Amino acid sequence: LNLNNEWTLDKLRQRLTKNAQDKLELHLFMLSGIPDTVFDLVELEVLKLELIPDVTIPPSIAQLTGLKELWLYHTAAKIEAPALAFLRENLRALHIKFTDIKEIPLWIYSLKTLEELHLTGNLSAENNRYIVIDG
Amino acid sequence: LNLNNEWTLDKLRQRLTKNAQDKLELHLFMLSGIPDTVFDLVELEVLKLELIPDVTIPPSIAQLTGLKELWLYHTAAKIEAPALAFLRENLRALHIKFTDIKEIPLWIYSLKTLEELHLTGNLSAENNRYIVIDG
């Protein structure tokens, strides 16, 4: 509530940017969570989340019918089945920048419409090569 | 009254939309009433009200010199003479979506410049066919 109040519902629209790939993006960093005002920005195509702890994706993400990219940079995420199915059906690319496995959402391998996967970080550990990517 | 404290020219401005016919529109739903700050958005041309109870049209509507359309979806509306006269002289279309007669404003038939009327709902009652439209 305090976050959504201090970062007003609409100031966000002035803050949006159409990026180099001609996709409308929003970039967020270092917040305590996701403002609920985000999911009224129906024009979105690329969401970037940077260094946000303990995130759970709410079902209102199904409102963002045009979303094509999600970037999770050091932002662990959990999710339930309706939002999860929406993302299963409505996503082209996924970018992840991680410190270790705990910042890798396990649900990604249950996805079906993905066209790009981008992992940034060391995928290997001592004597355990590529266990992380068996799926 | 405290609704008129938050929505503002600036806030509502970013939320506005220019529609397919190059008409500035605002769509609102499921609020407690009409913010008075709405009527300082002097460029507005279409007003939409959806599922808002117990609405009364205030006189500040005379500030919207460019209004051409009003859409009343399940919203009965009271009004007094000044706002009524402004609307008599400055309106082209009226859309109504209703469940029954209680959501039909009685004053619409005293209008004179209307060019379109759109009614969604049963226009008849038991043993009273088309009494709703005699006027």
From Swiss-Prot, chains A, B:
Q: How is it modified after translation?
A: N-glycosylated.
Query: Which sections of the protein are LRR repeats?
Result: 1-18, 19-41, 43-64, 65-88, 89-111, 114-135
Where expressed (tissues)?
Expressed in brain, kidney, ovary, lung, liver, heart, and fetal brain and liver. Found at high levels in bone marrow; lower levels are detected in peripheral blood cells. Expressed on T-cells as well as on B-lineage cells.
- As given in the record, the signal peptide range reads none
The entry's localization annotation reads: Cell membrane; Lysosome membrane
Q: Which family does it belong to?
A: Belongs to the LRRC8 family.
- Quaternary state and partners of this protein? Heterohexamer; oligomerizes with other LRRC8 proteins (LRRC8B, LRRC8C, LRRC8D and/or LRRC8E) to form a heterohexamer. Can form homohexamers in vitro, but these have lower conductance than heterohexamers. In vivo, the subunit composition may depend primarily on expression levels, and heterooligomeric channels containing various proportions of the different LRRC8 proteins may coexist. Interact with GRB2. Interacts with NOX4; this interaction prevents the ubiquitin-mediated degradation of LRRC8A.
Q: What does this protein do?
A: Essential component of the volume-regulated anion channel (VRAC, also named VSOAC channel), an anion channel required to maintain a constant cell volume in response to extracellular or intracellular osmotic changes. The VRAC channel conducts iodide better than chloride and can also conduct organic osmolytes like taurine. Mediates efflux of amino acids, such as aspartate and glutamate, in response to osmotic stress. LRRC8A and LRRC8D are required for the uptake of the drug cisplatin.
In the UniProt entry, the disease listed is: Agammaglobulinemia 5, autosomal dominant: A primary immunodeficiency characterized by profoundly low or absent serum antibodies and low or absent circulating B-cells due to an early block of B-cell development. Affected individuals develop severe infections in the first years of life.
Domain remark from Swiss-Prot or TrEMBL:
The volume-regulated anion channel (VRAC) channel forms a trimer of dimers, with symmetry mismatch between the pore-forming domain and the cytosolic LRR repeats, a topology similar to gap junction proteins. The di-leucine motif is required for lysosomal localization.
Name of protein = Volume-regulated anion channel subunit LRRC8A
Q: Which residues of the full protein are shown?
A: 405 to 539 of 810
